[PDB]
């Protein structure tokens, strides 16, 4: 629930789109296993898709470590320092590809409730409303019931 | 003394047709030698054993029955095979500079 979960405001790491888009994902560590039905999909992904993904995303360093593992994993490290660990255990090649692409397209900001679907650093151009807007001024600034 | 383990890699020889037809003449000669039926067990064994001894590559039992003609034998012996490990294959598959692969095995 929102009250039982932290929340943040919509934001970008370094105003990611103003000057130039920068892929926030920087590192992808695939812990895979030579043997084990759990990492069959991970093995097929390493064989057929990891190279294409690597050449498509030259800004991401991909470390494929094949060691005895019961739960193959993918660790995504983002520019902002965030580290997201996902299990690719018993996932097909298509599922692993979609997960990796989602990690690539996702920023490092925490996946928590976002208070507002928008974020403006300059919300007002004509002047934020205050009680004295839309209020006429009187001669010599006389408040009501003032005698002089 | 156990001989050193043989590598399963096998690259077909360039003079494969000439070697095969020489062995066919040795075993059995007629025109269209590629269609010589290998229905006789004696001749089939002779040809296949000679080819295996010469080339270091033998027909597996699974494909032994389907090697019905000299043409089939030629096809099997011209299709290549490699035994490099998966690590070697991945490393030699032209890995991009941002992809690093290592085994702890």
Swiss-Prot record, chain A:
The keyword Transmembrane helix does not apply. GO terms for cellular component: mitochondrial inner membrane; mitochondrial large ribosomal subunit; mitochondrial ribosome; mitochondrion. High relative levels in skeletal muscle and testis. Lower levels of expression in the heart, brain, placenta, lung, liver, kidney, pancreas, spleen, thymus, prostate, ovary, small intestine, colon and leukocytes. Expression is coregulated with TWNK. Transmembrane segments: none annotated. One of its GO terms (biological process) is mitochondrial translation. One of its GO terms (molecular function) is structural constituent of ribosome. Keywords: Mitochondrion, Ribonucleoprotein, Ribosomal protein, Transit peptide. Its main location: mitochondrion. It comes from the Eukaryota. It is found in: Mitochondrion. Belongs to the mitochondrion-specific ribosomal protein mL43 family. Component of the mitochondrial large ribosomal subunit (mt-LSU). Mature mammalian 55S mitochondrial ribosomes consist of a small (28S) and a large (39S) subunit. The 28S small subunit contains a 12S ribosomal RNA (12S mt-rRNA) and 30 different proteins. The 39S large subunit contains a 16S rRNA (16S mt-rRNA), a copy of mitochondrial valine transfer RNA (mt-tRNA(Val)), which plays an integral structural role, and 52 different proteins. This is Large ribosomal subunit protein mL43. It comes from Homo sapiens. The chain holds residues 2 to 149 of 215 of the full protein.
From Swiss-Prot, chain B:
Keywords: Mitochondrion, Ribonucleoprotein, Ribosomal protein. It comes from the Eukaryota. One of its GO terms (biological process) is mitochondrial translation. The keyword Mitochondrion applies. GO terms for cellular component: cytosol; mitochondrial inner membrane; mitochondrial large ribosomal subunit; mitochondrion. It is found in: Mitochondrion. Component of the mitochondrial large ribosomal subunit (mt-LSU). Mature mammalian 55S mitochondrial ribosomes consist of a small (28S) and a large (39S) subunit. The 28S small subunit contains a 12S ribosomal RNA (12S mt-rRNA) and 30 different proteins. The 39S large subunit contains a 16S rRNA (16S mt-rRNA), a copy of mitochondrial valine transfer RNA (mt-tRNA(Val)), which plays an integral structural role, and 52 different proteins. Belongs to the mitochondrion-specific ribosomal protein mL50 family. This is Large ribosomal subunit protein mL50. It comes from Homo sapiens. The chain holds residues 51 to 158 of 158 of the full protein.
């Amino acid at each position: 629930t929102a009250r039982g979960t932290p929340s943040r405001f919509l934001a970008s790491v370094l105003h990611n789109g103003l000057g130039r888009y920068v892929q926030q994902l920087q590192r992808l560590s695939f812990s895979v296993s030579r043997d084990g039905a759990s990492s069959r999909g991970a093995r097929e992904f390493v064989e057929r898709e990891v190279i294409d993904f690597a050449r498509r995303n030259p800004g991401v360093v991909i470390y494929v470590n094949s060691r005895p593992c019961c739960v193959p994993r993918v660790v995504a490290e983002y520019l902002n320092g965030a580290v997201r660990e996902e299990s690719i255990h018993c996932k097909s090649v298509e599922e692993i590809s979609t997960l990796v692409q989602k990690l690539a397209d996702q920023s490092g900001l925490d996946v928590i409730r976002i208070r507002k679907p928008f974020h403006t650093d300059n919300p007002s151009i004509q002047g934020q409303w205050h009680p004295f807007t839309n209020k006429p001024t009187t001669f010599r600034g006389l408040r009501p019931r003032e005698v002089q | 003394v156990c001989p050193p383990l043989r590598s399963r890699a096998y690259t077909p020889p360039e003079d494969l047709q000439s070697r095969l037809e020489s062995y066919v003449k040795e075993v059995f000669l007629p025109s269209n030698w590629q269609d010589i039926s290998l229905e006789d067990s004696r001749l089939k064994f002779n040809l296949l054993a000679h080819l295996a001894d010469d080339l270091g590559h033998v027909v597996p039992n699974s494909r032994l029955h389907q090697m019905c003609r000299v043409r089939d034998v030629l096809d099997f012996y011209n299709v290549p095979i490699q035994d490099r490990s998966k690590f070697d294959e991945l490393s030699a598959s032209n890995l991009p500079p941002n992809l690093k692969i290592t085994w702890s095995y």
